[PDB]
Amino acid sequence: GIVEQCCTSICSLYQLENYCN
Amino acid sequence: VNQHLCGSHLVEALYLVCGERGFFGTPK
């Protein structure tokens, strides 16, 4: 999920934007 | 430079890009 995608690896803006709502 | 969003950098970042739509659900 997010923490893996954005903290362990690196996440593009649009990766990051899809955990919104 | 360090590319990883961890902790409150990950939070501070969702607050930014989500905008009014937000995240972690909406009340109700």
Residue numbers in the entry:
A (entry chain A): 1 to 21
B (entry chain B): 2 to 29
Sentences from the paper on this structure:
In the cases of [PheB26]-insulin and [GlyB26]-insulin, we aimed to investigate the structural consequences of the loss of the TyrB26 side-chain hydroxyl group or the whole TyrB26 side chain, respectively. Loss of chirality at the B26 site (GlyB26 mutant) and replacement of the phenolic Tyr side chain by a polar Gln and Asp (GlnB26 and AspB26 mutants) did not have a detrimental, or a major, effect on the affinities of these two types of analogues (∼70, ∼77 and 89%, respectively). The most important feature of these analogues is the occurrence of the B25–B30 bend that detaches this part of the B-chain from the insulin core. In consequence, insulin site 1-related A-chain side chains are fully revealed. It seems that the B24–B25 peptide bond in [AsnB26]- and [GlyB26]-insulins serves as a ‘rotation axis’ for the B25–B30 chain, sweeping it almost 180° away from its wild-type direction. The [AsnB26]- and [GlyB26]-insulin structures show high similarity up to B26 Cα (only ∼0.3 Å between these atoms), but the B27–B30 chains proceed in opposite directions in these analogues. This is likely to result from the lack of conformational restraints of B26 glycine, as the crystal packings in both analogues are virtually identical. The dimerization properties of [GlyB26]-insulin were not determined in this work, but it can supposed that they will be significantly lower than that of native insulin. Comparison of the [GlyB26]- and [AsnB26]-insulin structures with the previously reported high-affinity B26-turn-containing truncated insulins suggests that the direction of the B-chain in the B26-shortened analogues may vary without having a large detrimental effect on their IR affinity. In summary, the [AsnB26]- and [GlyB26]-insulin analogues are the first naturally substituted insulins with a stable conformation that differs from that in all known structures of the native hormone.
Insulin is a 51-amino-acid protein hormone with two disulfide-linked chains (A1–A21 and B1–B30) that is responsible for the maintenance of metabolic homeostasis, with an impact on cell proliferation and regulation of ageing. It exerts its functions through binding as a monomer to the tyrosine kinase-type IR, which is an (αβ)2 heterotetramer in which each individual αβ extracellular chain comprises L1, CR, L2, FnIII-1, FnIII-2 and FnIII-3 domains. Therefore, we undertook further mutagenesis-driven studies of insulin, focusing on the TyrB26 site that we assumed might be the critical structural pivot of insulin conformational activation on its receptor.
